Amino acid sequence: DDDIAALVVDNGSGMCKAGFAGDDAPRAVFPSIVGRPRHQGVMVGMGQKDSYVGDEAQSKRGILTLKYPIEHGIVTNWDDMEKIWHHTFYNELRVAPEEHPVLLTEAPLNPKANREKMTQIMFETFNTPAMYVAIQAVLSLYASGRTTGIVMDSGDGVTHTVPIYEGYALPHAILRLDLAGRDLTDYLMKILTERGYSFTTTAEREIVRDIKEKLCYVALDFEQEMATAASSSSLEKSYELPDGQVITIGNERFRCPEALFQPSFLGMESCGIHETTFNSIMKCDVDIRKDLYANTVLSGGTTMYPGIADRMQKEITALAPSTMKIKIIAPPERKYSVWIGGSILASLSTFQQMWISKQEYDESGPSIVHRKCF
Amino acid sequence: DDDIAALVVDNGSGMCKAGFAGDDAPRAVFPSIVGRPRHQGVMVGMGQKDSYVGDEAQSKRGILTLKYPIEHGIVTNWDDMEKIWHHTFYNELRVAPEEHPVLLTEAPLNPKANREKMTQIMFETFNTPAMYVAIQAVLSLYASGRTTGIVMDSGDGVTHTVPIYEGYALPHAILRLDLAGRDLTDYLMKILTERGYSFTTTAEREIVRDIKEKLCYVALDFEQEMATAASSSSLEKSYELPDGQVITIGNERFRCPEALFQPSFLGMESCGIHETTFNSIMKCDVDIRKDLYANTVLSGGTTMYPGIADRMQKEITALAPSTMKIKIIAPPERKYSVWIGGSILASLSTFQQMWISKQEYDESGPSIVHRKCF
Amino acid sequence: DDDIAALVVDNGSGMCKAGFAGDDAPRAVFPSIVGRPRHQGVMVGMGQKDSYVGDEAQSKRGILTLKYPIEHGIVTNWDDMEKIWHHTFYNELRVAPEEHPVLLTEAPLNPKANREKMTQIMFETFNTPAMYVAIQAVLSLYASGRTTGIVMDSGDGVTHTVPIYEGYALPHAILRLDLAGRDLTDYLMKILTERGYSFTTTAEREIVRDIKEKLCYVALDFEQEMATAASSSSLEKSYELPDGQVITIGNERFRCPEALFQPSFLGMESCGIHETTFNSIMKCDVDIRKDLYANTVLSGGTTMYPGIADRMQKEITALAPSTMKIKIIAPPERKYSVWIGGSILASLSTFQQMWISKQEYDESGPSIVHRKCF
Amino acid sequence: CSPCPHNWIQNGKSCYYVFERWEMWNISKKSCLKEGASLFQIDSKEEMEFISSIGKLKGGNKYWVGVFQDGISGSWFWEDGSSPLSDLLPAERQRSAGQICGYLKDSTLISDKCDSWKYFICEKKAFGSCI
Ligand SMILES: Nc1ncnc2c1ncn2[C@@H]1O[C@H](COP(=O)(O)OP(=O)(O)O)[C@@H](O)[C@H]1O
Ligand SMILES: Nc1ncnc2c1ncn2[C@@H]1O[C@H](COP(=O)(O)OP(=O)(O)O)[C@@H](O)[C@H]1O
Ligand SMILES: Nc1ncnc2c1ncn2[C@@H]1O[C@H](COP(=O)(O)OP(=O)(O)O)[C@@H](O)[C@H]1O
Ligand SMILES: [Ca+2]
């Protein structure tokens, strides 16, 4: 009609999420991979989609191959990516890109060159009236809505801790982690295989993934938990493999997520989350620190483990001076929180000038989206 | 008058079947062997055909010898083979091949060389416009219209299990069993002999073939059936020899078919059909498996025995996870399945481009049929 | 008489290698199968051993059935293993267990549980004074004596690339590959069955395997050779089978080994060895990588084919940066080098505390071997 | 709660627990005691035939079982100290030093050393239903 929405598409490493602004949560969420028959060969007829992946790949599982054109949350390729965007618009959204503004969201260190290219697609192929480039970290923060605190965001590919004072993220405080659920699953596979299972494959990949999400938990004490494990009847939990095997999984459940706390499991030199939290605090002023400690915020898929909050308070409290108050917070469906923030910003009536427009593309080129804007 | 029919000749080991594509079933069907009076002896006059075989051979039984150029499906010698083809086209079909594009069927590990040879004969001697060559199982699979499932094919010479996902026979999983069909009859002659009958001869083999098809069945339980036999008033059924002898039969009944389940009767090392499905099942992805277990179909003349489906289901669950669903599907007139597959594919006007042309034959040689097509 | 040997026994998937430490090569080698008459069929008198296997079965080939408790290296069943060991000491070694301390070697990811089990058997049944169980990979690396480098280790059942820096193997770096000689043997029968032939059975596996070693070579250029294939007179080289038969070989000769380079042949998605190595190298630090490129060691079994080294050099040169030095090293007779590592490890006097003792077994239970040592 | 507390498998009247870990026979008994379970004892072939259902438990493992051997007499009993029927009892070796209460290795009952470590299985009565 009149009025316009903002398309909120966050181009996730594994799973891209898109929708309309004003929506509480993304209408679409689907795998972000590309896949074909590896085997192929051949048939009478077709009717196949060469490399949709998407929903169909996940159902697909055994047959298909997976590429992620943006594994490291960075558009590693434009050809496939267009496909994701095309699929998103036509297939899932079933919107015409002509009608609405879109906000793409971006991973944190996304070189200002790709950004221009991101823009050029949207204008050129997609022909959106206008689009905005977002930083997913930001949009997550936007959703949260708190000015000061130090939030730990662990998602799929990357983990950060960022102190936030009024709203401004102190750059210097921040530090990167390589680890996130991405690693966690792989590890889960690897430990599983020792016992005798072999989870080498991509189909098996997804099986491992399922196992960790339902199954896996975070220990009160790493050391105690092993010790218990020996006696532990409980841990023995069964998982039914798609084939009908039932495979038993005691200890792995806690060992897997433990890695975040102790990266050396995976062979990361990197410090665990808690060391991360402390470090980011130190980096900042003595005065401010209290504010962070009170307001620590969790975020992302990887933060969802029940038991994290209590471990974190436990961990931090040992570290920190006994005076300082320590609070922890974890908003209930944080994984979405990126998309959510994106959703909010996109919607913003007021902010609307911020959006990047077709003319601006023409005169300044896409780089505008990078410069003195997002 | 226009349009064309596909001549779908299925060269069977024992039985040639051929007709026009679009036909529900094979037009004309006859034993492939070659025979002439072994004894001969002369006479006054003539008017016998040296080595027609066909139908006339069958009633012929005492007089003729046999020879299967098509022994193990593979066409060992061209000269007889052409004779079959000539007979098929001219005598049974009564049609002149110049007129009709023809699809030929071929056996599973049929070498390239013969395939080309097949082309040379079809083009040169017959001079048909164009030919197609087919691989018999796929034609069977085509007929079914089953994209997914694990199928038992058991015909005359060979028995396979091929799992299929999305119309793809996954090469790896497939396994072969030497036995079928033949092995039953011969075993049938032998087990019969022990009782005191002699069925050495060719005529006798025909007799023997007759008995198993009508007479024989497969057991709910081998062990149980054996126990019962002593009582068995039932099994005793009589079969009248064409001379007019009568024989008693019936422990034989179950036992011969027993072979497939436990090949050791034959002395065959290989495992049962049931275990063969299982082996194949594992070969596939775990994820795919539920589909396979659910869709199991048996194909081929050897699958016709009453009772198999129920037996197979029982055998397989005992194998299977307990949770998983089981289905055994057997289409009614399966023997013809291969031919039908011949007819559908042949009959595909849409597909017609596949049809191999004399132009390709001359330019490419016969090879074009093999490479990049069938 | 004082001083002691270490009994170094190598429980291979297919072959056990055994003998006294310090010994340049294993004295005794024999197949690891279990084999008793499939047919049986009684007779008058006996004198046979139910399933000795080893050398004698091999001579037996037509008669016998083959099993590997050691299938994929990992000991699935204890009894046969108990048998295998019994044969080893008494029959082949003609040594008595009580007299000498023994080393035992293990498959890469061995369950602890079986470790105690292995540990259990030798003490209890064998009543060896003391034992050590070591990881086969580690022994092999011991054999090289290369502190660093990256070795491609291809044996019977499995293929690994293991980067080594400063005497340490960096677990993240190293990937596995199911493909290995066993698959090649199976592979080769299949394509041979392709043209003429049918090598279904156990004996035939042996026959093919014989072909496999003598026959097989790697091709400089996969593509090129195929082109060569049509013209090649040379390829045609001929083999005579155990009966009469003499069979022809030649395209399949290169093609079989091809799998290592292209796993897809066998239906494997996984990246080729050339691929494998590169990835693993990338896994490591950039600084170090120069080391691996300089030192790449071949290992095991499957690495023996002539001309692998140069092709290997070639592929890696292509992958590597232009500056980089690359060097491939393949020790002249590497298959043994697994056993070699053991002999040294066992043989090490200085190390001698390393051995596991009856008391450590008695107090600790078996697990002492697994825990805090080998 | 239900006829069996979780992670236990029911067979008719009985409930069984297959231990994750290795324990010594006596130790597992104490452990079993904690539950109020006992070690499993096999009154019948029927119960013995059920063991195969262990088979799905990965691989066969040796599992400590009720039967105990006196030593002087060498008589085999269960903890309750009843007599196993002939079927239950152990198999022979030429001779050596040592022997103790049986385990179960997959299909058949066996004996070993207690000191060794083995997996044990406990058995309890299911809360049999009355209406
Ligand atoms: N409920 C949950 N419990 C534990 N881990 C989860 C849960 N939900 C998602 N994850 C993990 O977190 C990741 C998704 O989080 P997300 O913030 O989207 O990561 P990213 O933004 O880096 O893609 C997934 O890879 C998944 O493994
Ligand atoms: N109704 C039936 N019951 C049992 N066996 C049959 C029946 N019909 C055919 N057969 C057997 O199956 C074979 C025919 O099946 P088919 O699939 O044509 O074998 P192939 O394709 O290998 O020649 C014959 O040899 C015959 O012995
Ligand atoms: N000279 C050779 N050329 C090619 N292949 C060989 C040669 N010698 C052995 N092999 C193959 O390598 C395997 C033996 O290597 P090995 O390292 O012992 O494997 P594993 O240690 O996994 O048992 C055998 O299966 C054999 O097929
Ligand atoms: Ca009881």
Please check whether residues A41 and A117 belong to one and the same domain.
yes
Q: Which residues contact A349 (CB under 8 A, 6 or more apart)?
A: none
Task: Kindly report the protein residue whose alpha carbon is nearest to atom 27 of ligand 2.
Answer: B181
Please check whether residues B71 and B25 belong to one and the same domain.
yes
> Dihedral through CA C224, CA C230, CA C232, CA C234, nearest 10?
110
Residues of A with CB under 8 A from a CB of B: 37, 39-41, 43-45, 48, 61-63, 201, 203-204, 207, 240-246
Distance C57 CA to ligand 2 centre (A): 39
Nearest ligand 2 atom to alpha carbon B12: 23
Rg (CA), chain B: 22
Cα(C78)–Cα(B301) distance, integer angstroms: 44
CA nearest to A151, candidates A138, A166, A164: A164
Cα(A163)–Cα(A279) distance, integer angstroms: 10
Q: Return the CATH number at B173.
A: 3.30.420.40
Would you tell me how many other CB atoms lie within 10 Å of the CB of residue D63? 23
Please check whether residues B14 and B127 belong to one and the same domain.
yes
**A267 and C74: CB-CB below 8 Å?**
no
Instruction: Give the closest ligand to the alpha carbon of residue C10.
Output: 3
Please check whether residues A219 and A313 belong to one and the same domain.
no
Q: Return the CATH number at C203.
A: 3.90.640.10
Task: Strand C356-357: give its sheet, edge to edge.
Answer: C28-31, C15-20, C7-11, C102-106, C130-135, C356-357
What is the pairing mode between strands A356-357 and A130-135?
A: antiparallel
Task: Evaluate whether B363 touches B123 at the Cβ level (below 8 Å).
Answer: no
Q: Amino acid identity of A33? A: I
C170: which 2 tokens? 């960096």
Would you tell me how many other CB atoms lie within 10 Å of the CB of residue A231? 14
**Would the CA dihedral through B81, B85, B88, B90 be positive or negative?**
negative
**B287 and A43: CB-CB below 8 Å?**
no
> Three-class SS string for chain C?
CCCCCCEEEEECCCEEEEEECCCCCCCEEEECCCCCECCCCCCCCCCCCCCCCHHHHHHCCCCECCCCCCCCCCCCCHHHHHHHHHHHHHHHHCCCCCCCCEEEEECCCCCHHHHHHHHHHHHHHHCCCEEEEEEHHHHHHHHHCCCCEEEEEECCCCEEEEEEECCEECCCCCEEECCCHHHHHHHHHHHHHHHCCCCCCHHHHHHHHHHHHHHCCCCCCHHHHHHHHHHCCHHHCEEECCCCCEEECCHHHHHCCHHHHCHHHHCCCCCCHHHHHHHHHHHCCHHHHHHHHHCEEEECHHHHCCCHHHHHHHHHHHHCCCCCCCCEECCCCCCCHHHHHHHHHHHCCHHHHHCEEHHHHHHHCHHHCCCCCC
Domain that holds residue B292: 137-178+272-337
Please check whether residues C263 and C280 belong to one and the same domain.
no
Instruction: Say yes or no: CB of residue B101 within 6 Å of ligand 2.
Output: no
B120: which 2 tokens? 């040379």
Using the 3D structure, point to which of A225, A248, A271 is the last residue of a domain: A271
Cα(A244)–Cα(B320) distance, integer angstroms: 8
Note if the bond before B102 is cis, omega within 30 degrees.
Answer: no
> Which structural domains are found in chain D, ordered by start?
9-125 (3.10.100.10)
Cα(A125)–Cα(A83) distance, integer angstroms: 11
Residue A24: how many CA atoms within 13 Å on its side-chain side?
Answer: 1
Task: Evaluate whether A367 touches A334 at the Cβ level (below 8 Å).
Answer: no
**C75: phi then psi, degrees, rounded to nearest 5:** -75, 110
Cα(A106)–Cα(A135) distance, integer angstroms: 5
Cα(B364)–Cα(B343) distance, integer angstroms: 26
Nearest ligand 3 atom to alpha carbon C182: 25
Please check whether residues C214 and C321 belong to one and the same domain.
no
Please check whether residues A282 and A363 belong to one and the same domain.
no
Cα(A10)–Cα(A5) distance, integer angstroms: 15
A75: which 2 tokens? 């558009």
**C160: phi then psi, degrees, rounded to nearest 5:** -135, 155
Instruction: Give the closest ligand to the alpha carbon of residue C214.
Output: 3
Smallest CA–CA distance from C266 into chain A, residue: A39
C273: which 2 tokens? 């060895």
Place of tokens 């049944």: C125
Please check whether residues B230 and B263 belong to one and the same domain.
yes
Which residues does a gap of C–N over 2.5 Å follow in chain C?
A: none
Distance from CA of C109 to the nearest CA of B (A): 22
Q: Please list the residues that pair with A132 across neighbouring strands.
A: A103
Cα(A76)–Cα(A182) distance, integer angstroms: 17
Of the candidates D20, D31, D56, which has its C-beta nearest A236's C-beta?
D20
Cα(C114)–Cα(B303) distance, integer angstroms: 44
**B111 and C201: CB-CB below 8 Å?**
no
CA nearest to B351, candidates B139, B99, B89, B128: B139
Place of tokens 């795998």: A31
> Dihedral through CA B42, CA B48, CA B49, CA B52, nearest 10?
-110
Please check whether residues C167 and C297 belong to one and the same domain.
yes
C16: which 2 tokens? 């056990």
Please check whether residues C174 and C188 belong to one and the same domain.
no
CA nearest to B152, candidates B172, B174, B181, B178: B174
Domain count for chain B, please give it.
Answer: 3
Resolution in A: 7.7
Distance from CA of D29 to the nearest CA of C (A): 18
Q: Which residues contact B94 (CB under 8 A, 6 or more apart)?
A: none
Q: What one-character DSSP code corresponds to residue A262? A: -
Please check whether residues B199 and B110 belong to one and the same domain.
no
Task: Evaluate whether C155 touches C180 at the Cβ level (below 8 Å).
Answer: yes
Biggest alpha carbon distance in chain D?
Answer: 55
Please check whether residues C149 and C159 belong to one and the same domain.
yes
CA nearest to C309, candidates C148, C174, C151: C151
Task: Evaluate whether B74 touches B107 at the Cβ level (below 8 Å).
Answer: yes
